[PDB]
Amino acid sequence: AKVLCVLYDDPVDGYPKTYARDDLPKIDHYPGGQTLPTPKAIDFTPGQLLGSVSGELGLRKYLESNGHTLVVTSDKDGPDSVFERELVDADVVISQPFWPAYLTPERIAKAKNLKLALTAGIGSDHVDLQSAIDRNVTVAEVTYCNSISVAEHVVMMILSLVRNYLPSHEWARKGGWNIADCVSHAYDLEAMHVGTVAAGRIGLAVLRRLAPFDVHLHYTDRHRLPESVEKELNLTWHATREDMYPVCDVVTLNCPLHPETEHMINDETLKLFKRGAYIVNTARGKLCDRDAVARALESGRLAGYAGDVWFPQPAPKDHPWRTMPYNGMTPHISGTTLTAQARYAAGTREILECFFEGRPIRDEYLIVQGGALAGTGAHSYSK
Amino acid sequence: AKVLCVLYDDPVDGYPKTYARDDLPKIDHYPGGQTLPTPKAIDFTPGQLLGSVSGELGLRKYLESNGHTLVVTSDKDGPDSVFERELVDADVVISQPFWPAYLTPERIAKAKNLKLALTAGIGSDHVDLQSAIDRNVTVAEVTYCNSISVAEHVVMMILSLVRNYLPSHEWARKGGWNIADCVSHAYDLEAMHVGTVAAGRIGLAVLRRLAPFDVHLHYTDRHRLPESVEKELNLTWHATREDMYPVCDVVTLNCPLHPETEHMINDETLKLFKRGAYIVNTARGKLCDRDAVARALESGRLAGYAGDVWFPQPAPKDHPWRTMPYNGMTPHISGTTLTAQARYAAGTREILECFFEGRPIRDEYLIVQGGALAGTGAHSYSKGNATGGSE
Ligand SMILES: NC(=O)c1ccc[n+]([C@@H]2O[C@H](COP(=O)([O-])OP(=O)(O)OC[C@H]3O[C@@H](n4cnc5c(N)ncnc54)[C@H](O)[C@@H]3O)[C@@H](O)[C@H]2O)c1
Ligand SMILES: NC(=O)c1ccc[n+]([C@@H]2O[C@H](COP(=O)([O-])OP(=O)(O)OC[C@H]3O[C@@H](n4cnc5c(N)ncnc54)[C@H](O)[C@@H]3O)[C@@H](O)[C@H]2O)c1
């Protein structure tokens, strides 16, 4: 089979020779009991840079040893990219959400041998699910691999916005002190109302981490949590996302991108937010109407916006989120820390082994299979 | 009496006429039961900028109406400063740790009328306590006013350093993407070992906040926590700070600055740290040898250093921590968010009313009283002078 794997470039100064530390912390399983990936073997050492072109997700030996072809490229956008040229006869397409090879309807029609589109991370919205269902393409992703890594990134961003960290670091770096200039836009998080749109793997990890900060917790989801869990975390349930907005100081988005959530944050829904509210979005860029968010920071409606996800990716040089007022943006990296890479590289291999060996792909990993949504796809998406 | 109050300058664009939000969250007391400040009244609206020269900690009406002269200035350094000139006959000196009026042995000796040195914030190390003790000056601070504010800043800073937030933000703002450049130095915090030097009000607030991150928690302190707390947070106790360093991925310093802690992080103790360790210091700058920390980052012994505290304050323009590799520094702001200012501005007024009315100053606020360390000062400090090099 031909495996076409789209990865990001290596660091500008080359593939790293050394790393900052010698080992990675050890984790046994994910919260709730799902086990870490179970490939028969791995050809890398956890901690190495695996999502860049030279890392190849540690898959070359395994594939070539089994008679497959592995094509690795970072050139993915447009009609003349290596990705589009190589796609026509690829049997398996792999890309990461951080540097995604978008599988539009037009690209899936041209990919005449396509049988599996694998996401090396979580979030398969860069793949047209309906064309995959119509073409019988299996769509799978590495469920839970970086859900905790993103939760950490959310808490970090929330505190950063509220405490005015970014601008204050600039003053230090530039030779100032200027305490008043740093703190006239700075508050403590303590006792603020924080709401999450979805309480899935990421959303629930965020809520647990925020609990000791003594904030008031709110949530909404397609799937309401058991009352006993709501009681344990002191959560207030909201049946709709619009009912939640008005009472929150901070809103964090942790739902997938699908037809029901696309453009949920827009000029109309932004009017439901209190003046000086904060939005953190590490889920997907398209959950927000781009210009409406910028207009809300320019007008003082929002006191801050931070996230690591944008639309499209890579974001254009001039994307307005890069420079709008009080932004705490990063390029898409929360789910691609070196720790996380080791887990999804291992799960990408487990899924390929199953797939080539004719064994079932875990259900938790499936998004689309055999002409319909399946497993996590049925739980969390909509076509 | 004459009250000499040193505050930081107003914003470069003027004293704000508007704020980002309409209210502040309401809190009832501090963790463990301590009540918030109880001045008889407050002449400000919580949420306003109070620690700057035009904010005056909301004290002018109260003081002038009671017969006291309030001299407010940001000019605090050197012998030709307004502060130095006015100090000779001030009865009461007020300063905040973020823009500290150093009361060195020399200044205390010239301050013929000084009776009370009040810290509008927490941390009185900018005052020579031995000289205060010698001269019978009362030293008081607004205990607990920003311990939670600071514990939030520590968690923020631990995450930023580990996840390599700052350099990543620079890439986004400059027009880049460069995923590999951002994550070649980024890890998840989950399951790392995190240790705190001291488990007081900030330290313990820090430990409670890190627990759900699933990290292994370690600590050391002059005063051991109760077994149920240790049990509840699954803490590992270390008799010495030198026993704890070696097993930690991240070390956060949360003790006061005094002779026993001054320069605890230096070229020799840095050698006990694992390679790629992180240090967060929002306590005091002088707990660390300045150049030793910069060398450790340059050499790779340390994978990050972040804090908001420096020595002296303000830090010189060329202070090395401003530009060393992998730093997550800010000027001294954690304890002076708009939220914390309302609490210490209220607490400063409560101590003054007590002082002037001949009512007892809360024991929890006392550092030095009647010729000796007293209240919180006997609990958390050791006597000496930490103001050397303040100039
Ligand atoms: N920034 C990053 O690196 C990164 C990394 C991982 C995931 N993510 C994003 O976060 C999403 C969530 O990840 P996860 O691991 O928590 O997944 P998950 O499937 O466990 O959780 C998603 C939750 O969203 C809820 N949901 C679905 N539709 C909804 C709707 N219309 N309204 C409200 N809630 C709805 C589901 O019921 C579920 O509880 C991913 O799909 C991806 O888009 C981003
Ligand atoms: N960045 C800022 O805004 C800011 C704000 C407030 C306080 N601080 C600093 O943090 C310090 C701690 O504040 P807090 O509210 O926790 O005070 P606290 O008195 O409640 O905590 C101090 C803890 O340090 C412990 N300790 C004392 N000497 C020690 C030693 N030699 N070794 C190890 N532990 C020792 C004490 O036993 C006590 O548990 C303040 O003194 C100040 O220096 C910084």
Contact A101, A83 (CB under 8 A): yes
How many Cα atoms occupy the beta-carbon half-sphere of B104 within 13 Å? 14
Helix (H) or strand (E) holding B240: none
Local structure of residue B29 (DSSP, 8 states): B
CA angle (A382 as vertex; A378, A383 as ends), nearest 5: 110
Look at ligand 1, atom 8, and give the residue with the nearest C-alpha.
A283
Residues belonging to the binding site of B for NAD(+) are 147, 201-202, 221, 256-260, 282, 308, 332-335, 380
Structure tokens at A268: 């109309």
Active site residue B178: no
CA angle (B191 as vertex; B190, B193 as ends), nearest 5: 120
Residue B25 has a CB neighbour count (10 Å cut-off) of: 17
Distance CA B132, CA B119 (A): 13
Active site residue B284: yes
- Ligand 1 contacts CB of residue A380 (under 6 A): yes
Structure tokens at A166: 């970014």
Residue written as token pair 């921590």: B321
Peptide bond into A37 cis (omega under 30): no
Method: X-ray
- Ligand 1 contacts CB of residue A284 (under 6 A): yes
Distance CA A92, CA B257 (A): 60
SS3 at position B325: coil
Distance CA B15, CA B267 (A): 43
- Ligand 1 contacts CB of residue A51 (under 6 A): no
Contact B152 A169 (CB under 8 A): no
Distance CA B297, CA B316 (A): 20
Exposed e or buried b per residue across A296-305, where buried means at least 16 C-beta atoms within 10 angstroms of its C-beta? bbeeebbbbb
Contact B337 A313 (CB under 8 A): no
Contact B155 A153 (CB under 8 A): no
- Ligand 1 contacts CB of residue A261 (under 6 A): yes
Contact B266, B257 (CB under 8 A): no
How many Cα atoms occupy the beta-carbon half-sphere of B81 within 13 Å? 18
Pick from A81, A87, A17, A85: which is nearest to A54 by CA?
A17
Peptide bond into B314 cis (omega under 30): yes
SS3 content of chain B, % helix, strand, coil (to 5): 35, 15, 50
Contact A114, A93 (CB under 8 A): yes
Instruction: Report all structural domains of chain B as residue ranges with CATH numbers, in order of start.
Output: 1-145+336-374 (3.40.50.720), 146-335 (3.40.50.720)
**Segment 330-389 of chain B within 8 Å of chain A by CB:** 330-334, 336-341
Distance CA A188, CA B45 (A): 17
Query: After which residues, if any, is chain A broken (C to N > 2.5 Å)?
Result: none
- Does B17 touch chain A if contact means CB atoms closer than 8 Å? no
The alpha-carbon gap from B121 to the nearest alpha carbon of chain A, in Å, equals 14
Pick from A301, A167, A181: which is nearest to B15 by CA?
A181
Exposed e or buried b per residue across A345-355, where buried means at least 16 C-beta atoms within 10 angstroms of its C-beta? bbbbbbbbbbb
Structure tokens at A262: 């696309």
Distance CA A82, CA A2 (A): 14
Partners of residue B165 in chain A, C-beta under 8 Å: 156, 160, 330
Contact B275 A330 (CB under 8 A): no
Contact A218, A248 (CB under 8 A): yes
The structure was resolved to a resolution in Å of: 2.0
Active site residue B369: no
Ligand nearest to the CA of B365: 2
Active site residue B60: no
Pick from A137, A138, A96, A114: which is nearest to A313 by CA?
A96
- Ligand 1 contacts CB of residue A221 (under 6 A): yes
- Does A147 touch chain B if contact means CB atoms closer than 8 Å? no
Pick from A34, A48, A52: which is nearest to B187 by CA?
A48
Contact A286, A257 (CB under 8 A): yes
Structure tokens at B203: 């330290």
Q: Could you write out the DSSP letters of every residue in B101-170?
A: --B-HHHHHH-TT--EEEESSS--TTB-HHHHHHTT-EEEE-TTSSHHHHHHHHHHHHHHHHTTHHHHHH
- Ligand 2 contacts CB of residue B119 (under 6 A): no
Exposed e or buried b per residue across B81-109, where buried means at least 16 C-beta atoms within 10 angstroms of its C-beta? bebbebbeebbbbbbbbbbbbbbbeebbe
Distance A282 CA to ligand 1 centre (A): 10
Residue/partner pairs of A216-225 with CB below 8 Å, 24 or more apart: A216/A191, A216/A192, A217/A193, A218/A193, A218/A194, A218/A244, A218/A247, A218/A248, A219/A195, A219/A244, A220/A195, A220/A196, A220/A244, A221/A255, A222/A198, A222/A380, A223/A379, A225/A199
CA angle (A236 as vertex; A293, A301 as ends), nearest 5: 20
Contact A154, A211 (CB under 8 A): no
Partners of residue B214 in chain A, C-beta under 8 Å: 27, 148
Residue written as token pair 């109880």: B38
Q: What type of residue is B88?
A: V
* Sign, CA torsion B149/B151/B154/B160: negative
Distance CA B210, CA B238 (A): 18
Residue written as token pair 């904030």: A215
Residue/partner pairs of B218-227 with CB below 8 Å, 24 or more apart: B218/B193, B218/B194, B218/B244, B218/B247, B218/B248, B219/B195, B219/B244, B220/B195, B220/B196, B220/B244, B221/B197, B221/B255, B222/B198, B222/B380, B223/B379, B225/B199
Ligand nearest to the CA of B252: 2
Residues belonging to the binding site of A are 122, 146-147, 201-202, 221, 256-260, 282, 308, 332-335, 380
Peptide bond into A314 cis (omega under 30): yes
SS (H, E, C) chain A: CEEEEECECCCCCCCCCCCCCCCCCCCCECCCCCECCCCCCCCCCCCCCCCECCCHHHCHHHHHHCCCEEEEECCCCCCCCHHHHHHCCCCEEEEECCECCCECHHHHHHCCCCCEEEECCCCCCCECHHHHHHCCCEEEECCCCCHHHHHHHHHHHHHHHHHCHHHHHHHHHCCCCCHHHHHCCCCCCCCCEEEEECCCHHHHHHHHHHHHHCCEEEEECCCCCCHHHHHHHCEEECCCHHHHHHHCCEEEECCCCCCCCCCCECHHHHCCCCCCEEEEECCCHHHECHHHHHHHHHCCCEEEEEECCCCCCCCCCCCHHHCCCCECCCCCCHHHCHHHHHHHHHHHHHHHHHHHHCCCCCHHHEEECCCCECCHHHHHCCC
Peptide bond into A46 cis (omega under 30): no
Catalytic residue among B96, B107, B126, B146: B146
Rounded to 10 degrees, the C-alpha dihedral B57/B58/B59/B60 comes to 120
- Does A234 touch chain B if contact means CB atoms closer than 8 Å? no
Distance CA B323, CA B309 (A): 15
Distance CA A221, CA A265 (A): 16
Exposed e or buried b per residue across B322-360, where buried means at least 16 C-beta atoms within 10 angstroms of its C-beta? bebebbbbbbbbbbbbbbbbbbbbbbbbbbbbbbbeeee
Structure tokens at B248: 């930690």
Pick from B317, B168, B302: which is nearest to A172 by CA?
B317
**C-alpha to C-alpha distances, A283 to A62, A216, A286, A327, A346, nearest whole angstrom:** 32, 22, 9, 16, 23
Residue of B146, B240, B244, B254 best suited for mutating to test ligand 2, as the one with most atoms within 8 Å of CB: B254
